[PDB]
């Protein structure tokens, strides 16, 4: 009816712009074919309240029982916007017609995944989605984009291993009523179901173990599409591990006893975040590119939410979503603000730009926007999610595990000062003069994620009293615009507009005259001497020698090197297996053939 | 000495594993279950006294056809890996000459024996298939005791499809009604059948189409030694 | 109805007929080849359409004798299913075959193709276990003079060892039919599955491990595989087709149909329980060795073995949720391997060899062929809303409730492994090419792709398709309602 309609319509919005390519046409119908899924999902909004909406669609002879739940619409909705914010801002960037055919097939993975209420349509949107993030960046440099199709097929295979002994072991299939049985069960097997789903879910995030496709995939690429390979194709290793506290929570508690007032399993998982966003952001300091410094940044925020929904039955999950949806919100926003200037412009790496805020003031304050989603800043959501994750933290006490956490905060903080620098300020290089300001269609997705975040920000709110209602009876007794913590308050009225009444009464301290006449930066201070326009003198070479030499020990230990290590121990046994069974000795195969003989003998 | 003797231990396995497998019965006769069937109504149904020639061309039917396809299929396989258009002998080096008149005047007393062989599978045992290997012999005695013997291909492999054919126009004519039945003794088709049941008016349906399945088992073996024996 | 019994006949008198018509000329001869083969869809799919038509196969007699004292030819479900597949891509090797392999003699190679489609409808037809093996030798003879038809020596070779290896496996193959026979009696397998309960614990046990053994060896497993690694790198181009999509479903359906034909017995148990290891062993060795491989068309000889191991996988590991998607993997490679040996023939026969220098290129230079190359190898490890990924994902759900978690974690282990080999491939055909030669080829730029857009539709409507396969598991998953189907 008005359910199934949503899921086919990216997939044929990939398939109504291949054949299409005879005007300017692929871009208006193709993006609109991705744009209906914000008012199906609206015009059913209402109707979450009644009882709640499913179909079934037999086919193959499985179930595929999709159904919308209180928090899967809550994904699917920012699955719809940062899709859209993406995609509108894709209209521009492509410089060929095969791209719409798998950026609109990863939505309808997306839109999948989300709306899967049962397995059989879970693990074939994850593998639509898989695919069409693959052949995505698979336009050039191969050898990084074939490690994210093995990594992420390895994952989605491991959770085919899990999804097939989890099927043997009840007998049934349907994923509602798996949850009634883990219950039944809940008054030896089951540590390897837990650990082969959080590597079948680590694979699409940050996890220290296995994050080595993140700083080639959402590393060269289309970068407008890139804003949804973070803000929607990694919320689905968030949504897999919720999935995974919706099936058993207290049966994974039983058999494996809690280490302090935190499970011990969401320790591990939460230990291992605290890992990702210690890494994540290290690694963003000392990484002189413009998209791979931003990989490190993507996998940096997941282990916000994989702390957040780690520890804490309650409020952890109420906190970490929360956190969900503010870093997908303004991490398409700094994905596109990064195609923007990748596309104006010409070269990657940063010794080709600097000071480039002056010609495109449009981009300077739509992320400058985004600057203040990031790291905590009271008007905006950064500082809310950031509050909301540190809140999760004290409660059920953890003292080891918020440290890591708070680093992050920091480190977070640290390398957005690295990009704001030599990308934006300083001065400009003589090839700049050829640039114009931002086009219109991505400039329409800046406006649409800016305003969403500055009503994201200032009041939670709206979507905080919506994750709290109908869904793990209310942890937050919260209004339009505080929030009503158990123990805090973080109102959002009396916060904003006391930053702006000290901006005026810092405006009042200023804006007084007597003389404020502009001079030009190639007159500067250099110690006090002359400085011409052929001086290299903003810095744009590693910014982070001291803090690369600090940790020089930890660093040698990297993980891309062990996984090249083992792929090429697998490829050389496969290059052994080759010339040892498979010979030219015909006496070889009879000598197999008597072997295998033998073994019917031996019965 | 390691591959000998390691090979001897495993087949010493092997064999001791078939033996103790062959703990059946001791050459018993509790062995038909189906097979008393295949006699008690072998004089009856067909027509043939002879008991193999019965089974294997009537009751196991598709049995004589896989078999003639296995035949025709190693001619036109051992064709196929030996073509050159030039097709010569190797250095015809003569020897001897009560060799090619002693194969000369007895290439007829063995054509005369082996049709004696495939019309007969009614009181004789056998049926098509050593009359027509003894056909290729032979050919074969005419082929190793001349300086070219070339029967004319153009014109041979004709009469082998043609009487593959002449096996099959029996089962397609005699699907004019069921699936075999015989076409020949039951019904009188072209001519009558069932006369008495000795050597006489040639029993049922099982004389003509070993003539047939004869004719073309001759001309198939001859041909595989004819593009064996062929040089540059 | 024994009219529909000239799926046997009508290839027989037409290669017949063939050698008859060699001498008279040379202009129909490979024309004699499409219209019989078309023939051979019309009497396919007669039967196609009266099988599914009513709940009963048809029992084709072989006479006025019923079974078991004659030979039954019980056409199945399964039966006309594979008869239309093989008549169908057979038709698409004789419309594909007339302009590619005019290298050689020709003269006698419509025989020796049409005997290999009478040993098809043959083995997926036949009810006596002698008939079973008489219709394999005539397949077998026919790929030992098929792939051996280049007279090249690294293709002289290629035959050689499967010549000396088949002709080892259909002697296994008669000692354990004897043996059978020496217990029991009886050659029918409606007599024999009622009567193979109480013969013999100890003589079953050899007769059924060495059948099992003996039908193997033409098809592949782990020992008696690596002559079909070089059977189809060293044969014409449309018999890889024909060996690649038919001869190994044969083989593996014809095991998995004696196999379930004695479930009652003791030491079953560790036949299968082995059937399960070597099928686990030959999706890991095939799909692992085509990681370093140089030659093109080796590379998808090695990926063909490894996706009939699987169907070995689920074909004998339980009764049901797997056998009938088991099949639904036999009727489903078939076609993308059809496929893939299509393009590696069109550029070994435009081109010229199969090396990767000479296959490098293929994006501007070639048209959509190099697209059917692509939307067949996604189509292996089955990443879309495809067809191979309804299959394995079937099979995979099959490997959960015996013998669970060791033979997933090797054949799902395999699928890793052919995500690298398909796109170290697809990316050194469109995205390194620098050559920009027209060299148009639009004599399959159609039907190939008609055959490329019925994977897109089985990808996404499977419910269409997979409710054949539920009444055509009930010829392999019981032996009541077959036994009671047939006397």
């Given amino acids: 009816n008005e359910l199934p309609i949503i899921l086919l319509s990216p997939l044929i919005g990939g398939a109504l712009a291949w054949l299409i390519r005879v005007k300017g046409i692929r871009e208006a119908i193709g993006v609109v074919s991705s744009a209906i899924p914000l008012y199906f999902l609206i015009k059913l909004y209402p109707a979450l309240e009644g009882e709640p909406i499913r179909y079934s669609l037999n086919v193959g002879g499985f179930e595929l029982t999709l159904a919308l739940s209180h928090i899967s619409w809550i994904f699917a909705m920012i699955a719809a916007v940062v899709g859209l914010s993406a995609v509108l801002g894709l209209v521009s960037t492509a410089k060929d017609s095969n791209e719409w055919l798998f950026a609109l097939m990863s939505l309808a993975g997306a839109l999948g995944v989300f709306l899967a209420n049962d397995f059989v349509v879970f693990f074939l949107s994850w593998e639509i989605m898989t695919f069409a993030s693959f052949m995505m960046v698979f336009k050039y440099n191969r050898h990084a984009s074939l490690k994210y199709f093995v990594l992420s097929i390895a994952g989605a295979y491991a959770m085919l291993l899990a999804i097939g002994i989890i099927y043997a072991k009840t007998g049934s299939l349907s994923f509602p009523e798996i949850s009634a049985i883990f219950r039944q069960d809940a008054m030896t097997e089951t540590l390897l179901i837990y650990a082969l789903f959080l590597v079948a879910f680590g694979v699409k995030a940050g996890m220290f173990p296995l994050h080595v496709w993140a700083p080639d995939a959402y590393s060269e690429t289309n970068q407008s599409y890139t804003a949804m390979f973070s803000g929607v194709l990694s919320k689905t290793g968030v949504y897999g591990f919720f999935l995974l506290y919706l099936l058993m929570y207290g049966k994974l508690a039983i058999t494996l006893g809690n280490v302090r007032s935190a499970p011990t399993f969401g320790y591990i998982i939460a230990f291992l975040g605290g890992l990702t966003i210690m890494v994540g952001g290290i690694l963003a300091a000392l990484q002189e590119d413009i998209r791979k410094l931003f990989a490190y940044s993507s996998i940096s925020q997941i282990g916000y939410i994989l702390i957040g929904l780690g520890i804490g039955t309650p409020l952890g999950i109420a906190a970490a979503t929360y956190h969900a949806i503010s870093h997908a919100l303004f991490k398409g926003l700094f994905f596109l603000i990064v195609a923007t200037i990748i596309y104006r412009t010409g070269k990657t790496e940063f010794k080709d730009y600097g000071g480039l805020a002056e010609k495109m003031p449009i981009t300077f304050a739509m992320a400058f926007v985004a600057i203040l989603s990031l790291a905590g800043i009271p008007p905006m959501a950064g500082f809310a999610s950031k509050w909301l994750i540190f809140e999760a933290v004290i409660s059920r006490n953890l003292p080891i595990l918020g440290a890591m956490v708070f680093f992050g905060s920091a480190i977070g903080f640290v390398y957005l000062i690295r990009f704001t620098y030599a990308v934006w300020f300083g001065q400009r290089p003589s090839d700049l003069e050829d640039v114009k300001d931002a086009p219109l269609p991505l400039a329409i997705g800046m406006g649409i994620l800016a305003i969403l975040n500055v009503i994201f920000g200032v009041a939670p709110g709206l979507v905080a009293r919506e994750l709290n209602k109908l869904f793990s009876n209310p942890p937050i007794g919260g209004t339009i615009w505080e929030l009503d913590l158990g123990f805090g308050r973080y109102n959002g009225l009396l916060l904003s507009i006391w930053l702006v009444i000290g901006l005026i009464i810092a405006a009042i301290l200023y804006f007084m005259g007597a003389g404020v006449r502009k001079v030009p930066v190639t007159d500067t201070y250099q110690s006090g001497n002359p400085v011409t326009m052929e001086y290299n003198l903003t810095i744009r070479r590693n910014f982070f020698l001291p803090l690369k030499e600090a940790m020089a020990f930890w660093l040698k230990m990297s993980f891309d090197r062990l996984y090249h290590d083992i792929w090429k121990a697998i490829e050389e046994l496969a290059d052994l297996a080759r010339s040892y069974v498979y010979n030219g000795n015909i006496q070889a195969y009879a000598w197999y053939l008597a072997i295998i003989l033998l073994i019917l003998v031996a019965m | ?232 | 109805s024994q009219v529909a019994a000239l799926l046997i006949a009508l290839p027989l008198i037409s290669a017949f007929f063939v050698p008859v018509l060699k001498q008279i000329g040379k202009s129909l001869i490979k024309p004699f080849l499409v219209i019989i083969t078309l023939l051979q869809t019309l009497i396919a799919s007669w039967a196609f359409v009266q099988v599914y038509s009513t709940g009963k196969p048809i029992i084709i007699y072989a006479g006025g004798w019923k079974p078991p004292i004659g030979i039954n030819l019980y056409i199945g479900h399964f039966a006309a299913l594979f008869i239309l597949v093989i008549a169908v891509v057979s038709f698409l090797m004789a419309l594909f075959n007339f302009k590619a392999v005019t290298v050689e003699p020709i003269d006698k190679y419509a025989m020796l193709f049409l005997l290999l489609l009478l040993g098809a409808t043959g083995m997926i037809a036949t009810g006596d276990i002698f008939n079973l093996f008489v219709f394999m030798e005539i397949t077998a003879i026919s790929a030992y003079a098929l792939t051996a038809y280049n007279k090249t020596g690294e293709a002289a070779e290629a035959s050689m060892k499967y010549i000396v290896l088949g002709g080892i496996g259909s002697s296994f193959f008669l000692v354990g039919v004897a043996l059978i026979y020496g217990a029991t009696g009886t050659l029918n397998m409606a007599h024999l599955a009622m009567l193979a309960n109480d013969i013999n614990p100890t003589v079953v046990q050899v007769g059924l491990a060495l059948i099992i053994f003996g039908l193997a060896v033409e098809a592949e497993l782990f020992p008696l595989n690596a002559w079909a690694p070089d059977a189809y790198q060293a044969a014409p181009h449309p018999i890889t087709v024909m060996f690649s999509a038919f001869v190994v479903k044969a083989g593996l359906y014809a095991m998995a149909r004696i196999l379930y034909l004695f479930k009652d017995v003791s030491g079953w148990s560790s036949l299968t329980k082995l059937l399960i290891a070597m099928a686990t062993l030959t999706v890991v060795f095939a799909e692992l060795s085509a990681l370093r491989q140089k030659n093109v068309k080796r590379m998808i000889a090695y990926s063909s073995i490894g996706q009939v191991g699987l169907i070995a996988l689920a074909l004998s590991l339980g009764t049901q949720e797997g056998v009938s998607a088991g099949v639904f993997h036999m009727l489903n490679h078939a076609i993308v391997k059809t496929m893939m040996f299509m393009a590696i023939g069109y550029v070994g026969i435009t081109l010229g060899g199969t090396m990767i220098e000479n296959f490098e290129g293929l994006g501007k230079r070639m048209p959509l062929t190099s697209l059917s190359l692509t939307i067949g190898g996604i189509a292996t490890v089955g990443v879309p809303l495809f067809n191979v990924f309804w299959s394995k994902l079937r099979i995979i759900l099959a490997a959960a409730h015996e013998g669970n978690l060791w033979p997933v974690a090797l054949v799902l282990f395999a699928s890793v492994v052919e995500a690298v080999y398909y796109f170290r491939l697809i990316h050194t055909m469109w995205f390194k090419g620098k050559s920009g030669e027209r060299i148009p080829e639009g004599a399959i730029a159609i039907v190939l792709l008609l055959l490329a857009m019925l994977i897109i539709v089985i990808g996404v409507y499977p419910t269409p398709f997979w409710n054949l396969v539920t009444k055509a598991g009930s010829d392999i998953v019981e032996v009541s309602k077959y036994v009671a189907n047939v006397l």
């Fill in chain 2, 1 to 232: 000495m390691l591959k000998r003797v390691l090979a001897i231990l495993t087949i010493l396995v092997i064999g001791y594993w078939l033996a103790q497998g062959l703990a059946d019965v001791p050459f018993g006769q509790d062995k038909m279950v189906v097979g008393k069937y295949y006699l008690e109504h072998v004089k009856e149904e067909t027509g043939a006294v002879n008991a193999v020639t019965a089974v294997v061309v009537n009751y196991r039917g598709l049995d004589t056809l896989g078999e003639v396809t296995v035949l025709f299929i190693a001619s036109t396989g051992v064709a196929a890996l030996l073509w050159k258009k030039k097709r010569e002998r190797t250095a015809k080096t003569e020897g001897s000459v009560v060799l090619t008149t002693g194969a000369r005047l007895l290439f007829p007393f063995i054509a005369l024996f082996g049709m004696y062989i495939f019309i007969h599978g009614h009181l004789t045992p056998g049926g098509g298939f050593p009359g027509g290997a003894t056909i290729a012999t032979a050919f074969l005695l005419m082929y190793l005791a001349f300086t070219i013997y070339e029967i004319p291909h153009r014109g041979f492999e004709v009469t082998e499809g043609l009487a593959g054919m002449g096996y099959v126009i029996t089962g397609l004519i005699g699907l004019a009604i069921g699936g075999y039945f015989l076409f020949d003794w039951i019904w009188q088709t072209w001519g009558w059948g069932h006369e008495n049941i000795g050597r006489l008016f040639s029993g049922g349906f099982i004389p003509i189409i070993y003539t047939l399945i004869g004719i073309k088992v001759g001309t198939e073996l001859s041909g595989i030694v004819d593009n064996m024996l062929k040089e540059e």
